[PDB]
Design an enzyme around this catalytic site. Structure first.
Site, mmCIF file in Angstrom:
data_model
loop_
_atom_site.group_PDB
_atom_site.id
_atom_site.type_symbol
_atom_site.label_atom_id
_atom_site.label_comp_id
_atom_site.label_asym_id
_atom_site.label_seq_id
_atom_site.Cartn_x
_atom_site.Cartn_y
_atom_site.Cartn_z
ATOM 1 N N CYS A 4 90.269 -66.856 61.970
ATOM 2 C CA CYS A 4 89.261 -67.606 62.697
ATOM 3 C C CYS A 4 89.442 -67.334 64.188
ATOM 4 C CB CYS A 4 89.411 -69.094 62.369
ATOM 5 S SG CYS A 4 88.392 -70.252 63.308
ATOM 6 N N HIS A 32 88.066 -77.381 59.446
ATOM 7 C CA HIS A 32 87.044 -76.468 59.957
ATOM 8 C C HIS A 32 86.296 -75.967 58.717
ATOM 9 C CE1 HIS A 32 84.731 -73.839 62.337
ATOM 10 N NE2 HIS A 32 85.675 -73.312 63.095
ATOM 11 N N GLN A 62 83.937 -72.810 58.854
ATOM 12 C CA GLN A 62 84.633 -71.525 58.902
ATOM 13 C C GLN A 62 85.097 -71.110 57.517
ATOM 14 O OE1 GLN A 62 85.199 -69.218 61.694
ATOM 15 N NE2 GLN A 62 85.467 -68.082 59.781
ATOM 16 N N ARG A 112 80.853 -80.897 66.849
ATOM 17 C CA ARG A 112 82.199 -80.390 67.089
ATOM 18 C C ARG A 112 82.919 -81.457 67.897
ATOM 19 N NH1 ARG A 112 87.104 -79.370 68.223
ATOM 20 N NH2 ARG A 112 87.758 -77.404 69.212
ATOM 21 N N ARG A 145 79.549 -66.924 59.582
ATOM 22 C CA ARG A 145 79.287 -68.295 60.032
ATOM 23 C C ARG A 145 77.788 -68.571 60.072
ATOM 24 N NH1 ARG A 145 83.375 -70.436 63.333
ATOM 25 N NH2 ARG A 145 81.909 -72.144 63.785
ATOM 26 N N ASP A 202 95.906 -67.869 62.107
ATOM 27 C CA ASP A 202 95.143 -68.520 63.161
ATOM 28 C C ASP A 202 96.072 -68.658 64.353
ATOM 29 O OD1 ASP A 202 93.013 -69.790 64.435
ATOM 30 O OD2 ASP A 202 93.227 -71.649 63.303
#
Ligand SMILES: N#Cc1ccc(O)cc1F
Ligand SMILES: N#Cc1ccc(O)cc1F
Lengths: 308, 298, 307
Positions: free
Chosen positions: A265, A129, A132, A102, A293, A225
């Site tokens: 998310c 991402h 996700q 990350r 996930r 988001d």
């Protein structure tokens, strides 16, 4: 063999993504049935910034593949400082069978992947991402069946990581993806062009619009988001006023198909990009989405390890 | 239908006895119970780090076949737009139980009401119920039946150990005395809960400023770090002269770390009444038993 | 009758050979030894973090069947809240071995004086004995028998690697040279211990300010960073004294044509070692880093069965 990485959603072809999503469904049913990392073999899980979802889903997923995650908060390290990323990648490749990272800039992920001799996975970055969105696609398939031909609309900041990955991963799945975002907040042009080209291969399409009501009408899946990431808090913009017409509220949801589902998310700012009524209501799939996930990332790791 | 363990009286007297029995069985056969085989996950979250809490829970969960996801205090601060309620809902999808070291009881109560897996108070401002399970296991293996024993706690009577020794102690049938100076007495709703629970077990609650009287005839003598701001506590130092007043074969307990020379002396803590090392070990066994018990009921 | 590994000469020559043999066996069959099955715990405690020490110990312990409990420097440093002796007595009830990265050697001695389980120095101010076990495993796999090889270390002659290469090197029968500028010479007690151990093994100790001489005819060239984080504010120019001791292509060319190069990580390219040497055919630095995993697993197996 070529070592396969997963730094952005289009790193999987349409056929490869279908394989990973089928494996994700299999692993959700039988979560300890695949043990490629039995030993245990190691996997590095490196955080330049913490994430509850990323930490728990990867650490436990790796363990359920038989492996051992070495989880690094890089703020307690001298990453980038005491040695080159190239040197770090070479050492990591001697201790672990994959590297999960990350980080912020995509070029760092690219650099790590060009020298590592093991698969590198983007756990979450400024630009994408993709893990996700694998979980999102698993969730949609669970609820709706075949992904091909569904209509998905995303609302809010059209240039953040989820907008980019919904474009790329959605069209890879054959989903018609709409991004509804105010002017000045549109998808990166190279990402958008990549998504339009990939959409040709699958029969999908890419739409970008400032008309939130048009984006919602007829949609099978509505997504939003947070409007601002941590890096953008000091960017100088009013990051509320442009986005208010794009809030995913009950009025907007009622314009979509009658059995439309809602994704988000985490984390979420109730009252900004989404309302309590929608977030906590019967169309919301946010908690299944978070759980997936775990399953989708396990499937990705199994798939990359066997191809690498 | 999900059971939590946030304070000592969350277990009834009969349920506490089951957990303590399981702790004795698990001490003998530490890998004989594998409810978390897979591994299944357990969250272990520290709002403030505790090294001995980490060792006992992390290894205990592993010996149940599980995998502890340990979140240190650096990693425990919630970023932009994160919330405790959304955290509990998400954790419930990844793990089979949540172990949490935090401060106010209100946070634990909130996590427990939202989570759909058992929540365990690893250590909090108001209670330290897992330490008292380890303490009771330690007393039992040295003395047998807990019912009717006399236990005295010395020092800061307002802290988590005093509250849990009151509640967990009277739940086991132990006559509990707290010896503390007047500004440092048990919270009055905890005292009243302990007095009420004691009516069911034949136990009793005493609060006194007389350390001599608290030690006289005691079977178990307990203290804890006091933290001049420490003058009111010096008359309560657990030293050799205080121990000389207890029953023969009395045992001394201290939830660590000990600051030798303050609340306890080198002579008492290294002496033959001391059980503080077995006590520390039993955090592992007692917490494993608690987890096994909660999981089977949830 | 509890064996510790706080400095390299805690193993006799015969014992070190046993550990190095086991490291080669474990590299071949990494999950064939499960002394910590259960899992049993092992403490891995950092008074100062080392992510590389973390990777190798955490995975090594797991591959022995155990579970590493890792404590980083973000917790209260051991010894501040209670005595080190009390800490050792509690840890001994939770784990089967204590791996600790700390500062002064007296702290390791204190823990080991009381612990009922093996204590391992993961890295300290004075010694880095696990890295030198990995170095010796690397040299053996590149060059065969260690006895009689010539090894030269360049740079700060009083840091943990210089001390451990002296002690661990002569324990293996290696002729060890430290090439270092005046003021940065090995601790006299360490040098004397190495000289005494060398009489048992046919090895030798040489300390010199002549880098060219140290390099000439060497089988193994080693260097390390010139400065630790704790030394950045010691007031010294820690660059100018060490420039003559840079491990560069010129210096390597003086050594034996089959010489190999070691460097415990991280490297500061352009200071103590050049890119040409780091990335060239003599460099064994990546195998060296990998062998931390295998050598530390062998050490743990060996100490556990002797305790
Ligand atoms: N992981 C992360 C994290 C932070 C705070 C908390 O209360 C729980 C967590 F899992
Ligand atoms: N940060 C992270 C990290 C992982 C492996 C390593 O050798 C160094 C590092 F900084």
């Amino acid at each position: 063999s070529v070592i396969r990485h997963f730094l952005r959603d289009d790193d999987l072809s349409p056929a490869e993504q279908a394989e990973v999503l089928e494996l994700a469904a299999e692993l959700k049913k039988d979560p300890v049935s695949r043990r490629p990392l039995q030993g245990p073999r190691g996997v590095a899980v490196i955080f330049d910034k913490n994430s509850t979802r990323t930490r728990f889903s990867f650490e436990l997923g790796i363990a359920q593949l038989g492996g051992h995650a070495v989880v690094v908060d890089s703020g307690s390290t001298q990453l980038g400082r005491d040695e080159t990323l190239q040197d770090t990648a070479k050492v990591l490749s001697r201790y672990v069978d994959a590297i999960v990272w990350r980080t912020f800039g995509q070029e760092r992920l690219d650099a790590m992947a060009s020298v590592a001799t093991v698969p590198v996975i983007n756990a979450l970055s400024d630009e994408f991402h993709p893990c996700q969105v694998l979980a999102d696609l698993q969730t949609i398939a669970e609820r709706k069946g075949a992904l091909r031909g569904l209509r998905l609309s995303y609302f809010g900041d059209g240039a953040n990581n989820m907008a980019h990955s919904l474009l790329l991963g959605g069209v890879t799945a054959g989903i018609h993806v709409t991004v509804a975002a105010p002017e000045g907040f549109l998808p990166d042009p190279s990402v958008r062009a990549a998504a339009e080209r990939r959409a040709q291969d699958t029969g999908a399409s890419v739409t970008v619009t400032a008309d939130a009501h048009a984006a919602a009408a007829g949609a099978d899946v509505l997504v939003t988001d947070t409007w601002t990431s941590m890096g953008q808090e000091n960017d100088g913009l009013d990051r509320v006023k442009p986005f208010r017409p794009f809030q995913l509220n009950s009025r907007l949801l009622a314009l979509a198909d009658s059995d439309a589902i809602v994704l988000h998310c985490l984390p979420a700012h109730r009252g900004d990009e989404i309302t309590d009524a929608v977030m906590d209501g019967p169309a919301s799939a946010v908690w299944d989405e978070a759980e997936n996930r775990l399953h989708a990332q396990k499937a990705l790791l199994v798939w990359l390890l066997e191809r690498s």
